[model samples]
Target: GKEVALTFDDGPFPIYTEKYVDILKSMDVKATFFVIGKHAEKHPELLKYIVENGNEIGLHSYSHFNMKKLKPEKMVEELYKTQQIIVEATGIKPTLFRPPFGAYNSTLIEISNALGLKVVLWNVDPDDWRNPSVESVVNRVLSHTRDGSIILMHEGKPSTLAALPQIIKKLKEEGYKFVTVSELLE
Candidate 1:
């Protein structure tokens, strides 16, 4: 079966994540959630739900700061703090990190790797954050997705949610099997 990874960042929020989880469950798809530490702290149950449902959890950041603006020490602190939160909440220290805005430096990379975290980057982004129409979002993803593709979306975007069912149906018809990001890489 051909496989793809669906990843959502900056979430596990009460506003959208529960609905996202419901959709994924209905489709029998597993995904990776790159959660913000601050948000996880606010919605610990949501984080736990993501983990309990067999979805992979990853760290985005404690405060979602641009690592390009931080000193090495500060960057390490951020990494550790986010990891700590994820561990405390989900009982799993994430092995994946997706930097905010895809911002990173060698120091940040080295620090992350030293912490045993792999940097997970996306191969396809529909720019759903812009709130494009559902059809546009679905088409953008279907046009770019391939075997082993890692797709980027966000939990808080209504357009993304609206487009999701169609995206899932089309990808399934196209013979694409959905996997969590870690499983895709593996």
Candidate 2:
């Protein structure tokens, strides 16, 4: 069987996060969520919900700014702040980091490594944020997914929510097992 990791970014959204957890529950699949620091600050309950539902959470950033644009000191502060937020909310010190916009540089990577975080990036991006047709979203993901693929997705998108069921069902049919980023890394 093949393995892939589904990672959602910029989440802890009010209604949509619950739905995503529900879908994962129905499918008996776990995913990794890269949540913004401020959003998690507002919805610590959602952070707990995600972990309780068997999903992994990672640091996205404090202000969701491009890490490539920030100085090293500012970048370190961003990572530290986000790491603290996630830990405080879930009692889990997240070891994974996904830079906002997937923009990073040597300094950011060094800072992340120094902070004991592994930078996680996706191999597949469906761009569901563009509001593509549900079918298009499903097709793009299914087509690009491979063994050990990390699929990038976002929360709170109508099309993403709609396409999720189909994506899971089809991928299961094709004998692909979904895992969290941590598991995938291992």
Candidate 3:
């Protein structure tokens, strides 16, 4: 069966992440969380909660720096540090990576692939970062969605949380099955 993956990035934070986990748990749906390494280190308990709930984790870099602005060596260091921190915290090395700002280059791809990380990019971006109204965000996502779509969202904004449950419920009503990014691609 075809599926769409609902992924959230730039998180594992206090209120946002905890609420997200609770919602996912209640819905009995799995999703992927691409976590910032520094944040993961600061909140290993959140990392543990994410892992414990059967959701997949992926590397989103150590500092959420843009690769386009970073030197090659610095980029590699960021990736390595994040991967190491995730491994240290969860005992599982991530096989997925989503570049911050969706910025990547040949260097980024080569390094990530060499480390066995599959680059997970979104097909549908609602631009929720702009904090568009809940109705607008939902309409944008629903309009752009297709089979096997990977929808990108963030955990930082209160508006996102407000829209999330409706998004999930509507997508389910449309007969779309939600999975983690790994599951969708696999």
Taking all chains together, each candidate's TM-score versus the true structure is 0.97, 0.98, 0.95
Find the number of clashing residue pairs for candidate 2.
0
User: Model 3: per-residue lDDT, tens digit, 90-185?
Assistant: 888889999999999888898898888988789999999989999999998889888999989887678888888888888888899888888787
In terms of lDDT, model 3 sits at 0.87
Per-residue lDDT of model 1, residues 1-186, tens digit only: 899899999997786898898899988988899998888888888988888888999999888888887988888888898888888888987999999999987888898999999987899999988789999999999999999999999988888889989989999999999998888887
RMSD of each: 1.0, 0.8, 1.2
Q: Candidate 2 versus the native: TM-score?
A: 0.98
lDDT of each: 0.89, 0.92, 0.87
**Model 1 reaches what TM-score against the true structure?**
0.97
The candidate maximizing TM-score is 2
Candidate 2 residue 177 Cα shift, in angstroms, is 0.9
Best by lDDT: 2
Distance from true location, Cα of 71 in model 3, Å: 3.2
User: To one decimal, what is the Cα RMSD in angstroms of model 3 from the true structure?
Assistant: 1.2
Worst 10 residues of 1 by lDDT: 65-74
Q: Model 3 segments beyond 4 Å from truth?
A: none
